[PDB]
PDB file of C-alpha atoms and ligand atoms in Angstrom:
ATOM      1  CA  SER A  31      37.741-172.289  52.525  1.00 43.79           C
ATOM      2  CA  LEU A  32      34.880-170.134  50.198  1.00 42.96           C
ATOM      3  CA  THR A  33      33.728-168.490  54.062  1.00 44.53           C
ATOM      4  CA  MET A  34      37.427-167.575  55.022  1.00 42.98           C
ATOM      5  CA  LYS A  35      38.239-164.163  55.102  1.00 44.37           C
ATOM      6  CA  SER A  36      40.768-161.268  54.347  1.00 46.15           C
ATOM      7  CA  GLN A  37      41.687-158.083  55.517  1.00 46.56           C
ATOM      8  CA  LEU A  38      42.069-157.577  51.586  1.00 45.45           C
ATOM      9  CA  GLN A  39      44.431-153.588  50.761  1.00 47.88           C
ATOM     10  CA  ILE A  40      42.549-152.024  47.937  1.00 50.16           C
ATOM     11  CA  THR A  41      44.331-149.491  47.324  1.00 51.72           C
ATOM     12  CA  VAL A  42      42.355-146.653  44.904  1.00 48.94           C
ATOM     13  CA  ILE A  43      44.030-145.570  42.729  1.00 44.34           C
ATOM     14  CA  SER A  44      43.110-142.546  40.315  1.00 43.76           C
ATOM     15  CA  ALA A  45      40.221-142.488  37.699  1.00 42.56           C
ATOM     16  CA  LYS A  46      39.409-140.387  34.744  1.00 44.34           C
ATOM     17  CA  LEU A  47      36.274-138.358  34.369  1.00 44.36           C
ATOM     18  CA  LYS A  48      34.680-137.799  31.148  1.00 39.53           C
ATOM     19  CA  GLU A  49      34.628-134.009  30.911  1.00 40.21           C
ATOM     20  CA  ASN A  50      30.349-132.133  31.645  1.00 42.14           C
ATOM     21  CA  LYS A  51      30.553-129.182  30.234  1.00 42.05           C
ATOM     22  CA  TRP A  54      32.956-125.203  34.625  1.00 40.95           C
ATOM     23  CA  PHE A  55      34.206-126.576  37.921  1.00 41.10           C
ATOM     24  CA  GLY A  56      34.881-129.370  38.149  1.00 40.78           C
ATOM     25  CA  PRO A  57      33.522-132.517  40.593  1.00 36.07           C
ATOM     26  CA  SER A  58      35.546-132.748  43.298  1.00 36.28           C
ATOM     27  CA  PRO A  59      35.989-136.834  43.631  1.00 38.60           C
ATOM     28  CA  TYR A  60      36.254-139.254  46.047  1.00 37.81           C
ATOM     29  CA  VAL A  61      35.324-143.503  46.092  1.00 39.51           C
ATOM     30  CA  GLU A  62      33.170-145.408  48.342  1.00 38.22           C
ATOM     31  CA  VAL A  63      33.729-149.013  48.388  1.00 34.51           C
ATOM     32  CA  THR A  64      31.343-151.498  50.096  1.00 35.51           C
ATOM     33  CA  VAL A  65      31.714-155.526  50.226  1.00 35.47           C
ATOM     34  CA  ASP A  66      29.625-157.351  53.242  1.00 34.55           C
ATOM     35  CA  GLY A  67      28.225-155.702  55.390  1.00 38.72           C
ATOM     36  CA  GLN A  68      31.215-152.448  54.065  1.00 43.44           C
ATOM     37  CA  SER A  69      31.861-149.279  54.158  1.00 41.96           C
ATOM     38  CA  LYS A  70      35.130-147.467  53.303  1.00 39.20           C
ATOM     39  CA  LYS A  71      35.995-144.139  51.666  1.00 40.55           C
ATOM     40  CA  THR A  72      38.596-142.296  50.167  1.00 39.68           C
ATOM     41  CA  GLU A  73      39.342-138.867  50.787  1.00 34.66           C
ATOM     42  CA  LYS A  74      38.559-136.577  48.138  1.00 35.24           C
ATOM     43  CA  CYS A  75      40.702-134.453  45.364  1.00 34.80           C
ATOM     44  CA  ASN A  76      39.380-131.455  44.585  1.00 32.08           C
ATOM     45  CA  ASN A  77      38.709-129.904  41.651  1.00 30.54           C
ATOM     46  CA  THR A  78      39.482-132.364  38.954  1.00 35.43           C
ATOM     47  CA  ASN A  79      38.496-134.367  36.405  1.00 36.12           C
ATOM     48  CA  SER A  80      42.068-137.169  37.055  1.00 35.36           C
ATOM     49  CA  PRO A  81      41.784-137.723  40.824  1.00 34.52           C
ATOM     50  CA  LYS A  82      45.053-139.521  42.037  1.00 36.27           C
ATOM     51  CA  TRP A  83      44.784-140.855  45.091  1.00 35.68           C
ATOM     52  CA  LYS A  84      47.000-143.831  45.282  1.00 34.87           C
ATOM     53  CA  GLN A  85      44.875-144.493  48.934  1.00 35.94           C
ATOM     54  CA  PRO A  86      44.570-147.848  50.636  1.00 35.05           C
ATOM     55  CA  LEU A  87      42.059-149.116  52.414  1.00 33.10           C
ATOM     56  CA  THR A  88      41.180-152.389  53.402  1.00 29.36           C
ATOM     57  CA  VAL A  89      37.538-154.591  53.598  1.00 28.97           C
ATOM     58  CA  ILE A  90      37.388-158.229  55.003  1.00 27.97           C
ATOM     59  CA  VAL A  91      35.858-159.852  52.377  1.00 25.93           C
ATOM     60  CA  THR A  92      35.910-163.987  51.269  1.00 25.55           C
ATOM     61  CA  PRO A  93      36.755-165.573  48.028  1.00 23.08           C
ATOM     62  CA  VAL A  94      33.441-164.667  46.457  1.00 20.59           C
ATOM     63  CA  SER A  95      32.720-161.485  48.045  1.00 21.01           C
ATOM     64  CA  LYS A  96      31.569-158.712  45.484  1.00 22.92           C
ATOM     65  CA  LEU A  97      32.881-155.406  45.776  1.00 21.18           C
ATOM     66  CA  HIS A  98      30.855-152.200  45.010  1.00 19.71           C
ATOM     67  CA  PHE A  99      32.820-148.903  43.932  1.00 20.93           C
ATOM     68  CA  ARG A 100      31.096-145.536  43.886  1.00 15.28           C
ATOM     69  CA  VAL A 101      32.299-141.937  42.963  1.00 16.81           C
ATOM     70  CA  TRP A 102      30.910-139.266  44.402  1.00 20.57           C
ATOM     71  CA  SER A 103      31.329-135.923  43.928  1.00 21.63           C
ATOM     72  CA  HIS A 104      31.794-133.814  48.061  1.00 23.05           C
ATOM     73  CA  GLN A 105      28.992-130.726  48.458  1.00 20.54           C
ATOM     74  CA  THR A 106      29.052-128.767  51.209  1.00 20.37           C
ATOM     75  CA  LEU A 107      25.938-128.269  51.156  1.00 22.20           C
ATOM     76  CA  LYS A 108      23.583-130.555  50.066  1.00 21.26           C
ATOM     77  CA  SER A 109      23.667-134.508  49.377  1.00 21.27           C
ATOM     78  CA  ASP A 110      27.698-135.776  47.777  1.00 23.74           C
ATOM     79  CA  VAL A 111      26.578-136.483  43.550  1.00 26.19           C
ATOM     80  CA  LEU A 112      26.304-139.759  42.728  1.00 25.33           C
ATOM     81  CA  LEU A 113      29.112-139.221  39.575  1.00 27.15           C
ATOM     82  CA  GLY A 114      29.489-143.314  38.757  1.00 23.62           C
ATOM     83  CA  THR A 115      29.645-146.996  40.117  1.00 26.07           C
ATOM     84  CA  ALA A 116      31.849-149.705  38.555  1.00 27.11           C
ATOM     85  CA  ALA A 117      31.506-153.667  40.560  1.00 26.32           C
ATOM     86  CA  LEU A 118      34.167-156.328  40.689  1.00 27.20           C
ATOM     87  CA  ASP A 119      33.387-160.031  41.608  1.00 26.48           C
ATOM     88  CA  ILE A 120      37.006-161.065  43.864  1.00 26.71           C
ATOM     89  CA  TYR A 121      35.800-164.625  42.366  1.00 26.93           C
ATOM     90  CA  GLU A 122      36.154-163.539  38.937  1.00 25.14           C
ATOM     91  CA  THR A 123      39.852-162.146  39.898  1.00 23.76           C
ATOM     92  CA  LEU A 124      41.358-164.687  41.605  1.00 23.93           C
ATOM     93  CA  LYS A 125      40.580-166.816  37.868  1.00 25.63           C
ATOM     94  CA  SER A 126      42.308-163.884  36.002  1.00 23.02           C
ATOM     95  CA  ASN A 127      45.222-164.711  38.452  1.00 25.27           C
ATOM     96  CA  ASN A 128      45.946-167.985  39.134  1.00 25.26           C
ATOM     97  CA  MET A 129      43.839-168.231  43.024  1.00 26.81           C
ATOM     98  CA  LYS A 130      45.690-164.955  43.907  1.00 24.51           C
ATOM     99  CA  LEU A 131      45.739-161.485  44.574  1.00 24.66           C
ATOM    100  CA  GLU A 132      49.257-160.031  44.396  1.00 24.79           C
ATOM    101  CA  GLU A 133      49.444-156.476  43.638  1.00 25.78           C
ATOM    102  CA  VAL A 134      46.213-157.425  40.936  1.00 26.21           C
ATOM    103  CA  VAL A 135      45.530-153.723  39.160  1.00 28.57           C
ATOM    104  CA  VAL A 136      42.959-153.568  37.603  1.00 27.48           C
ATOM    105  CA  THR A 137      40.228-150.419  35.854  1.00 28.95           C
ATOM    106  CA  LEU A 138      36.933-151.043  35.829  1.00 27.78           C
ATOM    107  CA  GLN A 139      34.523-148.750  33.259  1.00 27.66           C
ATOM    108  CA  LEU A 140      32.395-145.938  35.485  1.00 27.30           C
ATOM    109  CA  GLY A 141      28.156-146.195  34.616  1.00 28.47           C
ATOM    110  CA  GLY A 142      26.205-143.627  34.878  1.00 30.98           C
ATOM    111  CA  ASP A 143      24.274-143.126  37.922  1.00 31.18           C
ATOM    112  CA  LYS A 144      20.686-141.385  35.752  1.00 34.47           C
ATOM    113  CA  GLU A 145      21.472-143.760  32.844  1.00 36.56           C
ATOM    114  CA  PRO A 146      23.296-147.137  33.896  1.00 34.17           C
ATOM    115  CA  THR A 147      23.857-147.509  30.408  1.00 30.56           C
ATOM    116  CA  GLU A 148      26.141-145.073  29.343  1.00 29.04           C
ATOM    117  CA  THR A 149      29.695-145.067  30.166  1.00 29.38           C
ATOM    118  CA  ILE A 150      31.498-141.411  32.515  1.00 29.91           C
ATOM    119  CA  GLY A 151      34.437-141.996  33.249  1.00 31.52           C
ATOM    120  CA  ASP A 152      37.026-145.337  34.696  1.00 27.70           C
ATOM    121  CA  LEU A 153      38.552-146.282  37.893  1.00 24.44           C
ATOM    122  CA  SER A 154      41.863-148.074  38.690  1.00 25.38           C
ATOM    123  CA  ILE A 155      42.785-149.646  41.743  1.00 25.77           C
ATOM    124  CA  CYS A 156      44.799-152.726  43.022  1.00 26.49           C
ATOM    125  CA  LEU A 157      44.605-155.205  45.323  1.00 28.12           C
ATOM    126  CA  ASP A 158      46.429-158.187  47.436  1.00 25.92           C
ATOM    127  CA  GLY A 159      46.230-159.644  50.359  1.00 26.14           C
ATOM    128  CA  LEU A 160      43.874-162.718  49.351  1.00 21.76           C
ATOM    129  CA  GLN A 161      44.611-166.003  47.887  1.00 21.14           C
ATOM    130  CA  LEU A 162      42.193-169.428  47.487  1.00 18.76           C
ATOM    131  CA  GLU A 163      45.023-172.419  48.481  1.00 19.24           C
TER     132      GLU A 163
HETATM  133 CL1   CL B 201      34.132-159.031  37.297  1.00 20.45          CL
END
């Protein structure tokens, strides 16, 4: 029951990234959960990326979703801009135990400094219920 899986759709909607003082980042989002990793495509040179991109992951009612916002680079590692996490069980609680097009915004915490908010990330969850 807490072990039954669902192929959850997560639409990664958009993010607002605090400006860094010339050209902006070229961000995409990676979702990781339960052995899996799914990445959106990138937006180029923007602190207000709008992906509106649906991804799926196979989760249980107690899975914990982890988000990373990366900036793409050709010639070295992509840069980790910030991270967030969302407990699917808490999300279910907040929405009568059924995730039907639930929009959630999360604060993104900095890589080098976890305590610093570097932006926020909006997603929409659909296709999971408990009971
Ligand atoms: Cl949470």
